Amino acid sequence: MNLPEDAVLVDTRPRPAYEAGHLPGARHLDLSAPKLRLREEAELKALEGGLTELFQTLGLRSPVVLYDEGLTSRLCRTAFFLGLGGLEVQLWTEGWEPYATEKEEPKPERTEVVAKLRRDWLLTADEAARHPLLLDVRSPEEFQGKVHPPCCPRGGRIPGSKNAPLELFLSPEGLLERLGLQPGQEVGVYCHSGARSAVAFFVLRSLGVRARNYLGSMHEWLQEGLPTEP
Ligand SMILES: [Zn+2]
């Protein structure tokens, strides 16, 4: 993979791996999946302000190249938030390893970049509720409501959603065909709390699909008391 000029590098691996050696100048950022509630404009503006503080503290600016060992959930989750904030991002999953030589962590000066939410990358609960096609990337047992995590009130799925377990997205060849999709089509993706839905989002976008990521996912849906199946 070729790199764009003057790129800022972000390493999404766990800290010990980062400290054992990272690309010169790369910042460490391995974001966990927050449980977000995005219903009011003020909540969307708070997510945005949080990304601004993050971007400035890490000295980020476009273009950003994020790297990790393979297409990991943390790489995708982290890259999704940076791109969601308006930064131009790219994922680098192989080929950077020979350059992971730096042990010292950079202490860049803050930048003054300001995040601006990219609404076409996102789905709020209300937008997801009106979406023509949502893909639930959890396991079939979760999709069928047979099991659920203890932080949620019951097992279930968003009504009308279709199950596309995450593992399917690791085999892009013929994926759209198998999922019954085509380039340009509007598709939403979700899971429990947006932890791994970004993997499906990036894979689908790379295939030309207008994918949108419902970060709130099942957890927000259930906390809101929205309609569910079974
Ligand atoms: Zn939950």
TrEMBL record:
Q: Where does Zn(2+) bind?
A: C151, C152, H192, H219
Q: What's the superkingdom here?
A: Bacteria
Positions carrying Cysteine sulfinic acid (-SO2H) = C191
GO MF annotation terms: metal ion binding; thiosulfate-cyanide sulfurtransferase activity
Q: Which InterPro entries match?
A: Rhodanese-like_dom, Rhodanese-like_dom_sf, Thiosulfate_sulfurtransferase, Thiosulphate_STrfase_CS
Keywords on record:
Metal-binding, Repeat, Zinc
Taking every annotated instance into account, which residue ranges of this chain make up the domain Rhodanese?
3-108, 128-230
Q: Which residues carry this modification: Cysteine sulfenic acid (-SOH)?
A: C191
Tagged with keyword Repeat: yes
Supply the CDD domains for this chain.
Answer: RHOD
Q: Which Gene3D superfamilies is this protein grouped with? A: Rhodanese-like domain
Name the PANTHER family for this protein. THIOSULFATE SULFURTRANSFERASE
Task: Report the protein name in the record.
Answer: Probable thiosulfate sulfurtransferase
Please name the source species.
Thermus thermophilus (strain ATCC 27634 / DSM 579 / HB8)
Q: Give the source lineage, highest ranks first.
A: Bacteria, Thermotogati, Deinococcota, Deinococci, Thermales
